[PDB]
RNA sequence: AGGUA
């Protein structure tokens, strides 16, 4: 049982155990990328599987192949923390073994030579973080998993569009893992057609005769052979009896001799069963009824070689009695059905200008480029590579299982190129369907689509940087020496590392990890993107991928997703689900015996989900797994019904499955509106972190889970006893057991402390634990952001009460009481950066220095000798940081300014000032200061006392370690040396490094003092190589961009408050606009005296149907009650036995609760740690959908001794009279959402231009005007708005010239303007004379 | 070719003689990259050539 | 790119 929860016991209530616990929240990212980066003892997923792929390389033409050995990863040159700090990615290199071998030249093939290039270096690829993420350049980004069709065949149905016709077609698409699709699609004309990407269609018999096939052998291959004996006269047939189906009588159908069934007549299944039953053997028939088939072969004379018949034509009259004195006795025509096999393929020759392989190669190669003469090679070649080169056209495993699976094969397994017999198959399998005999597939059932996940991406994208270094290799070995050289010297590492680069860092899917909550980068790293390269664009809409599809339950979450253009797209995983093997969904559900519940799991995929039939996880179940309900619901076909409880197959594991992270965590969701959940499980990830990150009381048990898994907590890896606890490192003695053999020492963890996060907002770790506690794997030792003793706490509790009061609360405002900002809580740090460059300009380098020409002595006072600010010094908007300052060029002088300096003696400065301000409207402390001054530039102070600062600490920090390490050493030298002799008299008063100069006579204990000598030395040049290599680090500078002399990195830290104006919110989505922060006593107040924090709209309740907000409150007056009750128990300190019993109470108070009881704990410590950690109140887990109940929540009320109606009269505060009846009042737990007033102010009146038009925009300290668009000037012509407009479109929008006549007549005190032309119309007027346009302007 | 890639594919003029020197100096910065496998030191890049570095880096 | 209405 962990100490984190001894320490803090979440009451949780639920009435079906799980029995399954939360997977790794990461585990997505964490196993792709082992995928990728793990070597493979054969071809499987990543680099191996690319290497392989593209190798060997063969030269073209001089028997000079490059072999592929293995790859190493070396271990890369900084840290992630080196790494952030000095913005450089965390990356490691990439080295491979390969063998240039050279055959017999010339003569067939066999090794004559053979040479090995070791670890050659081709590219840096970044390496994955502990949290799942990369570092780039020095921010921390994350690769979205992408949801894209699987590659594989789709028979989708073409409606809503019917070439004016009618009657929905089918269409075969193959879709290849990479390579070019293939499309079979029909037409109004029953005819089919082929097309290679989407150029345009031709008949599908071209790509049939390009494989190489006869018009009888498709024929054959297709349709079904009909047998006609030249007998009697004008022929009989052979009739298979199962045959005649949906056919009217126009032959007479005779059986043993005699005619069953008359011409004219309607077959019905009696005359089919007859016939079947007297087995019909041959018929005669009338030649009307011959006249109408088709013959499948060619038929020549059997006499003198006279072409007759061909293949695939009507048959007549003519041609009959030809076939007949030509000699023939045996006739195959095709069987064509209406209802079975129809005239699709025969039509489709029909429609074919080909009939040979050549003329169909022509026709490909000219509707795939246009014109380009069709050279039979060339047309080869292309038809080739299409569908035939594997380093051209792949399906890759995914690809042949799907491909496999929609033909219905036993085969999972196969070549990743095309065959013929698949080429078939799969226009077998569209014609039946277009018979009705197949069912077509959705493109949205999960089952079809697969999640590229990092790993498989970045090997897409590596395997594209070796096609395109295999086209330099191959290039080379052709240019290059046919002969011995060295491969290093022709392997290019820049296109494969600057291409890996481009996609980790510049992509549709590669983003800035949303870092202000863990929950916040748990759903990131968790999320599922249907764009990106490969996916889907945003033009869509296209309704159907964004509708949530029945297939989702269990594997995607279906109520989060943002509310933008891109709804339905952008997804969050489920919270159980994890990728297939082949990159499909598959959820877990515990496995089903016909009578008992089995613990046992199957991560069942999306289409063997829909094989069984799967219960709901409301089923209700008594000892092991029997079912109370005879029928219980469950789903078997995508479809809810009721089944006996002896047919189910498979259970949901949890209640919680069907949702993820965002959604799992708020509480009552079954008691909210989708949308409105939606809402708050989207705002829930936008919390800022807040300095006093409590709890929320009402929970649902994924927060343990949520800041475990996610890297912002610091997690004990190996138990053991907290030796050192410090708010920046915390040592922990490791336990015997879990000690590697030999001194392995302490573990250390250094707390990352305000850094500034991806959205300016501040991440630090505070130690949660104390000297000498216990602590074992698992544990929670330091408590990130937003995070306290292991729970996720992204907002805060507080009372809020439910009434509207004088209209402050109107449309979703909130009111808030001054208790709030004076408890410093809501309170936020925003650490944003600032970054002031010196470059090497062409007027001259710029410098950094104290001393700044016509400044005031207040900016100087604040820097050093060196221009720098110093750390910890407060600064406000405008304040000067870097006193960097620019030589100035030549200076032009208006002839004023001449009489001016000739006056005053002055002349112009040599130096401009370009020290770096402070941006006006932000303020707060410098915290850190990073210097970058790039190798071979000399150093300033300020670098040199950085540097100095980090080398000590690196130094305290290995002399720490050190001396615990070499304290054990001389502890065990002496336990030896007392052995064999007592020496423990003198040597127990000498220091311990003098305890070496004492020898001992030979034997077992002087040869283990000499090997523990040779130790120490050994620790000591371990110490100083470690030393030396930190300080080679530490002491280097960076290699900066071209042009920049140095950078000075600045971090503000902004303690915000929060003030009017600022959006807050709830966890079920109720949100709004800080109103106005009334003074304490204003805030209506309970009978005994608390006054209300906050102050919440009733109306936006009934109407957003949000109610599990109320149920919420509810539930935090229940725990806010037992909470004042324990407080006033421990205040009161009764004793151990009463707190014990009351919080025994406590937790056993519900219904078929799986809380587990006390005692299992310590009798005293423990109790009044648990009390000291409850007095502020009694966390509550609410399970998703396994939740409290009203009996429950009212129960727990009246323990806390409140009222069961959870309504309580409030006293006002301005009138000091009671309102009439009860009001709602309840600890609720509230957001501070990132939408922070302060950042949405900006205001203009002169500032930043453009240069191509006028129109204020720009500037991130001082931004542009407000887009006063087409909508606002439809807006004044709705008004005689004239006047106004004018102003809108030419005063401030673009005239420059009266935009500068306005100011200086509203500066002079006058109000008039010049209509002038704004600069915009002028633009507009050169542009199109550059066409070849005349535009003027004519007077009357 | 090699004079129509110096001219028509650079938007802002460089010279023909320019276009070699930067071509010598990123032949020798991949040499330089592949042999010691981290990166294009700048020193290095200034030893090989009788270029003194502040020329090479503009 | 993500997020807000």
Not at chain 1, 449 to 466: C, D, H, K, P, T
Not at chain 1, 1064 to 1075: E, L
């Amino acid at each position: 049982y962990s100490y984190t929860e001894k320490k803090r016991i979440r009451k949780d209530f639920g009435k079906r155990p799980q029995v399954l616990d939360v997977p790794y929240l990461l585990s997505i990212q964490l196993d792709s990328f082992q995928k990728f980066i793990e070597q493979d003892p054969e071809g499987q997923y990543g680099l191996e599987a690319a290497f392989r792929s593209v190798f060997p390389i063969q030269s073209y033409s001089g028997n000079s192949e490059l072999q592929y050995v293995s790859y190493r990863l070396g271990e890369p040159v900084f840290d992630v923390q080196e790494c952030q700090i000095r913005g450089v990615t965390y990356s490691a290199p990439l080295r491979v073994k390969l063998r240039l071998v050279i055959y017999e030249r010339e003569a067939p093939e066999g090794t004559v030579k053979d040479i090995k290039e070791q670890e050659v270096y081709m590219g840096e690829i970044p390496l994955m973080t502990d949290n799942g993420t990369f570092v780039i350049n020095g921010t921390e980004r994350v690769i979205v998993s992408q949801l894209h069709r699987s590659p594989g065949v789709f028979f989708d149905s073409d409606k809503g569009k019917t070439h004016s016709s009618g009657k929905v077609l089918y269409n075969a698409r193959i879709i290849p893992y990479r390579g070019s699709w293939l499309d079979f699609e029909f037409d109004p004309k029953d005819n089919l057609f082929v097309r290679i990407d989407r150029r345009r269609k031709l008949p599908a018999t071209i790509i049939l005769r390009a494989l190489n096939y006869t018009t009888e052998q498709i024929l054959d291959l297709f349709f079904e052979k009909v047998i006609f004996e030249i007998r009697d006269n004008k022929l009989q047939m052979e009739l298979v009896p199962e045959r005649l189906r949906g056919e009217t009588a126009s032959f007479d159908i005779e059986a043993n001799g005699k005619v069953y069934v008359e011409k004219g007549r309607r077959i019905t299944a009696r005359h089919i069963r007859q016939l079947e039953k007297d087995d019909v053997k041959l018929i005669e028939v009338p030649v009307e009824y011959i006249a109408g088939k088709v013959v499948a072969k060619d038929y020549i004379d059997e006499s003198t070689g006279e072409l007759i018949c061909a293949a695939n034509m009507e048959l007549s009259l003519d041609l009959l009695a030809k076939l007949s004195q030509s000699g023939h006795k045996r006739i195959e025509t095709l069987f064509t059905n209406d209802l079975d096999h129809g005239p699709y393929i025969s039509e489709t020759l029909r429609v074919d200008p080909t009939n040979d392989r050549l003329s169909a190669l022509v026709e490909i190669y000219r509707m795939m480029r246009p014109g380009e003469p069709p050279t039979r090679e060339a047309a080869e070649s292309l038809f080739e590579n299409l569908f035939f080169s594997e380093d051209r056209y792949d399906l890759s495993a995914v690809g042949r299982m799907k491909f496999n699976r929609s033909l219905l094969r036993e085969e999972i397994e196969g070549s990743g190129i095309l065959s013929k017999d698949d080429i078939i198959d799969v226009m077998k399998k569209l014609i039946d369907i277009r018979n009705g005999k197949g069912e077509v597939d959705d493109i949205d059932h999960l089952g079809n689509r697969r999640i590229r996940s990092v790993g498989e991406m970045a090997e897409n994208q590596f395997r594209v940087g070796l096609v395109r270094v295999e086209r330099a290799v191959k290039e080379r070995l052709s240019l290059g020496d046919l002969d011995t050289l060295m491969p290093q010297d022709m392997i290019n590492a820049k296109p494969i590392s600057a291409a890996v680069k481009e996609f980790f860092g510049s992509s549709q899917l590669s983003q800035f990890m949303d870092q202000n909550n863990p929950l916040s980068e748990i759903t990131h790293k968790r999320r599922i993107s249907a764009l990106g390269p490969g996916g889907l664009t945003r033009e869509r809409a296209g309704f159907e991928v964004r509708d949530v599809h029945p297939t989702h339950y269990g594997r995607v979450c279906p109520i989060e997703t943002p509310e933008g253009p891109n709804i339905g797209l952008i997804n969050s995983l489920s919270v159980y689900a994890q990728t297939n093997e082949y990159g499909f969904l598959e959820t877990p559900y515990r496995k089903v015996t016909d009578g008992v519940v089995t613990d046992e799991i199957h991560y069942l995929s999306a289409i063997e989900e829909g094989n069984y039939v799967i219960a709901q996880a409301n089923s209700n179940l008594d000892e092991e797994g029997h079912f109370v309900e005879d029928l219980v619901t469950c789903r078997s076909k995508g479809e809810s019904s009721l089944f006996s409880r002896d047919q189910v197959d498979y259970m949901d594991v949890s209640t919680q499955q069907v949702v993820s992270v965002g959604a799992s965590l708020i509480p009552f969701l079954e008691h909210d509106d989708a949308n409105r959940a939606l809402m708050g499980a989207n705002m829930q990830r936008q919390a800022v972190p807040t300095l006093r990150a409590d709890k929320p009381l009402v929970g649902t048990g994924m927060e343990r889970a949520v800041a475990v898994d996610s890297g912002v907590t610091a997690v004990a890896k190996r138990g053991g006893v907290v030796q050192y606890v410090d708010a920046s490192r915390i040592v922990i003695k490791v336990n015997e057991d879990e000690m590697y053999p030999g001194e392995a020492g302490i573990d250390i963890y250094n707390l990352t402390k305000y850094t500034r996060s991806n959205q300016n907002t501040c991440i630090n770790q505070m130690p949660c634990v104390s000297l000498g506690e216990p602590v074992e794997r698992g544990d929670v030792l330091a408590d990130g952001p937003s995070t306290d003793l292991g729970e996720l706490a992204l907002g805060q509790n507080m009372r809020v009460a439910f009434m509207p009061w004088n209209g402050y609360n109107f449309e979703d405002s909130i009111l808030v009481s001054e208790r709030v900002v004076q408890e410093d809580r809501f309170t936020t740090i925003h650490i944003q950066e600032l970054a002031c460059v010196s470059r090497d300009t062409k007027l001259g380098p710029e410098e950094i220095t104290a001393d700044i020409p016509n400044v005031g002595e207040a900016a100087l006072s604040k820097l050093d000798e060196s221009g720098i600010v110093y750390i910890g010094a407060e600064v406000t908007g405008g304040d000067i940081l870097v006193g960097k300052v620019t030589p100035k060029g030549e200076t032009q002088l208006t002839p004023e300014e001449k009489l001016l300096r000739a006056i005053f003696g002055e002349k112009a400065s040599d130096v401009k000032d370009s020290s770096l301000r402070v941006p006006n409207g932000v303020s707060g402390t410098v915290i850190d200061v990073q210097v970058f001054t790039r190798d071979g530039v000399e150093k300033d102070k300020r670098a040199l006392e950085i540097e100095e600062m980090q080398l000590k600490q690196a130094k305290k920090d290995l002399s720490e370690e050190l001396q615990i390490l070499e304290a054990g050493l001389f502890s065990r030298i002496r336990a030896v040396l007392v052995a064999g002799g007592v020496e423990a008299e003198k040597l127990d008063k000498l220091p311990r490094d003098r305890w070496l100069e004492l020898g001992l006579t030979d034997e077992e204990k002087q040869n283990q003092l000499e090997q523990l000598a040779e130790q120490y030395d050994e620790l000591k040049h371990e110490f100083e190589k470690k030393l030396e290599a930190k300080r080679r680090k530490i002491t280097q500078g960076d290699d900066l961009a071209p042009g920049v002399l140095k950078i000075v990195k600045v971090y503000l830290a902004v303690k915000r408050r929060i003030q009017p104006g600022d959006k807050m919110a709830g966890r079920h989505g109720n949100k709004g606009v800080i109103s106005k922060i009334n003074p304490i006593e204003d805030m209506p107040y309970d009978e005994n005296g608390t006054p209300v924090d906050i102050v919440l709209n009733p109306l936006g309740v009934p109407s957003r149907m949000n109610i599990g907000q109320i149920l919420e409150t509810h539930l935090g007056m229940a725990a806010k009650g037992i909470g004042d009750k324990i407080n006033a128990m421990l205040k009161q300190q009764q004793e151990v036995a009463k707190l014990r019993e009351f919080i025994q109470r406590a937790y056993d108070l519900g219904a078929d609760v799986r809380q587990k009881v006390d005692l299992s704990t310590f009798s005293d410590e423990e109790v009044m740690r648990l009390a000291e950690n409850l007095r502020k109140g009694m966390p509550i887990a609410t399970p998703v959908f396994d939740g409290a109940k009203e009996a429950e929540i009212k129960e727990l009320l009246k323990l806390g001794d409140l009222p069961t109606s959870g309504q309580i009269r409030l006293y006002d505060g301005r009138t000091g009279e009671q309102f009439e009846r009860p009001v709602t009042v309840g600890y609720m737990y509230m957001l501070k959402l990132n939408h922070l007033v302060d950042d949405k102010m900006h205001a203009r009146s002169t500032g930043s231009y453009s240069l191509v038009t006028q129109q204020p925009l720009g500037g991130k300290a001082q931004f542009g005007g407000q887009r006063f668009g087409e909508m606002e000037v439809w807006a004044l012509e709705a008004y005689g708005a004239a006047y106004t407009l004018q102003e809108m479109l030419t005063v401030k929008s673009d005239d420059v010239n009266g935009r500068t006549k306005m100011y200086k007549n509203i500066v002079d005190g006058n109000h008039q303007m010049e209509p002038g032309m704004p600069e915009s119309f002028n633009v507009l007027l050169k542009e199109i004379r550059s066409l070849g346009i005349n535009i003027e302007l004519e007077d009357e | 070719i090699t004079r129509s890639i110096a001219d028509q594919a650079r938007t802002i003029r460089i010279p023909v003689h320019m276009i070699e020197t930067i071509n010598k100096l990123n032949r020798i910065s991949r040499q330089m990259l592949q042999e010691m496998g981290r990166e294009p030191t700048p020193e290095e890049l200034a030893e090989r050539m009788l270029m003194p570095e502040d020329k090479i880096r503009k």
